[PDB]
A paper describes a structure:
One example is the fibrils formed from SAA1.1, the fibril precursor protein in systemic AA amyloidosis. Amyloid fibrils are fibrillar polypeptide aggregates which occur in a range of diseases that includes several neurodegenerative diseases and different forms of systemic amyloidosis. The fibrils can have a length of serval micrometers and consist of cross-β structure and of β-strands that run roughly perpendicular to the fibril main axis. In this research we use cryo-electron microscopy and other methods to analyze the ability of serum amyloid A (SAA).1-derived amyloid fibrils, purified from systemic AA amyloidosis tissue, to seed solutions of recombinant SAA1.1 protein.
Residue numbers in the entry:
A (entry chain H), B (entry chain J), C (entry chain L), D (entry chain F), E (entry chain D), F (entry chain B), ...: 1 to 69
The structure:
């Protein structure tokens, strides 16, 4: 299939964005995650804009444009 | 299939955005997650805009535009 | 199928946005999640705009536009 | 399949962006992750713009443009 | 398949961006990761722009352009 | 398959960007990673621009251009 | 402009289907035409079907079809 | 401009299908035409079908088909 | 400009299909044409089919097909 | 410009298919044409099919096909 | 310019398919043409098929095919 | 310019397929042409197929094919 992972402007302990496929007779274990933040300024911020998730985009003409200032 | 994960401007302990597919005779275990925040300013913020989730977008013309100022 | 996950401006302990598909003879366990916040300012905020969830968008013309100021 | 991982502007303990495929008779274990931040300024920030996730983009003409200022 | 990993502007303890494929009778173990930051300024920042994830882009004409200022 | 790893502007303890393929009867172990930063200025920063991840790009004409200032 | 002349199954003396355009300070003369027919069988016949005269035909789909027997 | 002349299955004395364009200070003369037919069988006949005259045909899909028997 | 002349299955005395363009200070004369036919069988006949006159045909897909029997 | 002359299956006395272009201070004269036919069988016949006159045909895919039997 | 003359299956007295271009201070004269046919069988016949007159054909794919039987 | 003359399967008295270009202070005269045919069988015949007249054909792929039987 199509697997896509996009992530921007973020903070995490871990175990993120994974894609396990077609496994047979498997087994695993994952730990505990801790996230501690104290007294931080301006964290995990993203600017203006749009998100588009599309399986098929066909015959677009003069489309999907963005004009910032 | 089509799997898409998009995430911006966020903070988490963990175990996020995953896609397990086509598994047979499998087994797993995941931990406990802790998220602690104290006295932070301006966290996890996202700017203006739109979100579009589409399986098929066909023949768009002069569409999906954004004009910021 | 089509699986799409979009998330912005948020804070969580964990175990979010997942998509398990086509599994046979499987078993798993997930932990306990704790979220503690004390004295934070301006958290998890998102700016202006719209959300569109569509399976099929066909023949749009001069549509889906956004004008900020 | 198609696996794509894109990540920008972020801070994490670990175990991120992975893609396990076609495994048989396997087993593994992953640790615990800790993320500690105290008194940081301007962290994990991303600028303006858009995200597009597409399986197929066909016959685009004068599309997908961005104009910053 | 196609595996692509792109990452810019980030700080992590480790165990990131990996792609395990076609394994039989294997086993492994991974450690614990710690991320500690205190009193840093301007970390993990990315500038303006867009992200495009596409399996197939066909017959684009005068498309995918970016104009900064 | 096609494996591509691109990474710019970042700091990590280790164990990153790897691609294990076609292994049979193998086993390994990986350590613990520590990342400590205190009082640094301007770290892990990337400039303006776009990211494109594509399996096939066919017949592009006057496309994929970037104009900085 | 667009000038199109289509003629099928016909008999004439002459001076037909002409298109004079953009003339300045011109002059001409044309003769007399005689058409004489006596005792002919099966002349100037056209079979089944349709005529379409269009300046612009846009986005036709599964249209303009003809099924004879 | 676009000048197109199509003629099939016909009999004429002459002076047909002409296109005079952009003439200045010109002059001409044309004769007399005679058409005489006596006792002919099966003349100037055209088979089944359609005629389409179009300045622009855009984005036709599974259109303009003909099925004879 | 575009001048196209197509003619099939026909009989004429003469002076047909001509295209005079961009003439200055010119002059000419043309004769008389005679067409005489007596006792002919099966003359000037064309088979089944269609005629299309188009200035621009753009992006046709599975169109303009003909199936005879 | 583009001048194209296509003619098949026909009988004529003469002075046909000509294209005079860009003439200055010229002059000419043309004769009389005679066409006489008596007792001929099966003359000037064309088989099945289509005619297409186009200035521009762009991006046709699985189009303009003909299937005879 | 582009001048193309294609003619098949035909009988004529003369003065056909000519292209006079860029002439200055010229003059000429042409004769009379006679065409006489008596008692001929099967003359000037063309088989099945299509005619395409195009100034530009761009990016055709699996198009312009003919299948006879 | 481009001058092309193609002629097959035909019978004529003369003065055909000529291309006079770039002449200054010239003059000429041409005779009378006679075409006489009596009692001929199977003359001027052409087999199945297509005609294509194109100024530019760009990027054709698996196109312009003919399959006879």
């Amino acid at each position: 299939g199509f697997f896509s992972f996009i992530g921007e402007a973020f903070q995490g302990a871990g175990d993120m964005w994974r894609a396990y496929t077609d496994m047979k007779e498997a087994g695993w274990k994952d730990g505990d995650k801790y996230f501690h933040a104290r007294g931080n300024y301006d964290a995990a911020q993203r600017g203006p804009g749009g998100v588009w998730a599309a399986e098929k985009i066909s015959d677009a003409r003069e489309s999907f444009q963005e004009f910032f200032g």
